[PDB]
Structures are given as C-alpha cells and as structure tokens.
Amino acid sequence: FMSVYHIKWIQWKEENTPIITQNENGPCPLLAILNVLLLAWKVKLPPMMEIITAEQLMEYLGDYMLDAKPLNYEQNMSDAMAILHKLQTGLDVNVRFTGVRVFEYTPECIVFDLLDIPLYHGWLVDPQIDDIVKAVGNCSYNQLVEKIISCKQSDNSELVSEGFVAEQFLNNTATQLTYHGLCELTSTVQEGELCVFFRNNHFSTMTKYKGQLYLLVTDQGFLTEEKVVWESLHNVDGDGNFCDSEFHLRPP
Ligand SMILES: [Cl-]
Secondary structure, X not given: OOOEEEEEEEEEOOEEEEEEOOOOOOOOHXXXXXXXXXXXXXXXOOOOOOEEEHHHHHHHHHHHHHHOOOOHHHHHHHHHHHHHHHHOOOOOOOEEOOOOOOEOOOOOHHHHHHHOOOEEOEOOOOOOOHHXXXXXXXXXXXXXXXXXXXXXXXXXXXXXXXXXXXXXHHHHOOOOEOHHHHHHHHHHOOOOOEEEEEEOOEEEEEEEEOOEEEEEOOOHHHOOOOOXXXXXXXXXXXXXXXXXXXXXXXXX
C-alpha cells in the first residue's frame, strides 16, 4: 500500500516550515508525530518538496531516531522501528480518565518515549462528582467497558450502581473531551510546547500560545489556504476559531 501526502509550506516563527496534510488515512499518529518534529525544525525536508510517500515519512522518522542516539538504545530503536509500522497499521491507544498524560501502557509508548514527544488526551472524570470518580476509578477505556458488563451482572448493589454510573459517564462524554479535561490540558501544556493530542482515535499536533490550546489544521481542504494553520481548542463541542501561522483570526 503506497500512500502520498501533500506538504503545506507555512511561515512558522518567521521561517519557511513544512506541515504534512492528511490524505485517505486521515489524522493518523504518523502525521501528528512528524508535524511536531517539522514545527520543532528537528526534521528538515527539501524546500522544493510538494509531495511525499508514507514510506519516505517512515524513513525520515527512523533516520531521526538513529541521528538523536546519545547497546540497549539499539534494541529500543529496533523495537520502535518494528512498532513504528503499527503507526500506519492501527494504534490501540487506551486512555485512563484520571489525568491528561495517563494511558494504559502499550508498546507504542516506546515510540513517544524514544522520540521524547508528549502524548495527551482530555477525557477526564470531573473530580467534583464523587460517584463517577469512584465508579470509573483507575479504569482504562477498555477496562471500563468490561467493568460495566461485569458490574451489571453483580449480586452486589453497590457494584451494580458503579456499572450504570460508569455507563452514564461514557454516554455523556462520548466526544472524548470533557470541560475538566480541557482545563487540565490548558494548565498542563507549557507555552510553546509541541505535542500530540488524542481524541476519538484521531491524533493532532497541539501547541499552547498565550495560554490558549491550538490544533494544527491538517485537513486536505485547506492545502492552499495560507491563513488557515491553527484551530483553537476552547470548547468540548462545536468548531474552534481558524487562525494563521501567527495565531491571528483568519479574516472572513
Ligand atoms: Cl510563536
């Protein structure tokens, strides 16, 4: 399977900087990870370049690992390279609902750790609602759907309660971003940090500028719109504000 991606050239901190736009693959982890490294100027593309294969994207990412090498790192780099192909053949990312950096460990955590790129989500139980805090506890998404099923079958009333309360949480927060998650993300990401944001099995490049969270606009529809670079993340539901590469509102 050969995939081709269109490169958008933007002015990022007053320097000519490429971003990879999504094709049929959509907002896959590979684009979100690459775009962090391109914006950080840790990977440079040829100034010509308009188009790039998934294969070349992979070569660039693996070359960046051998170049950023500073015996066991060899194993980890090799394991990361094998795992790196899962970044195109599905990533099973499993959040916990207790913190913006908390996920169930899967071997793909090897890639983010070796690349030293932070991974975040904002699917967070509101700590002010005690029955949800207790019902969800430390569950991963996958553990909670299992807990719901087990707990509804229980002869113990309390456990049947936690089951229904956990189901209510999943139904009511099905967008996979909560207001509390958005607040914890905003205060946790540092000014100018480049990072990956996980929501609804989609990966986005995220930054913070003057206290405000933005997602990099990767949608193919905006390839020639130089003034659409960032989208504000300021609410759980509805569209953010489209901004240029300097975070100013795109004129209507
Ligand atoms: Cl800036």
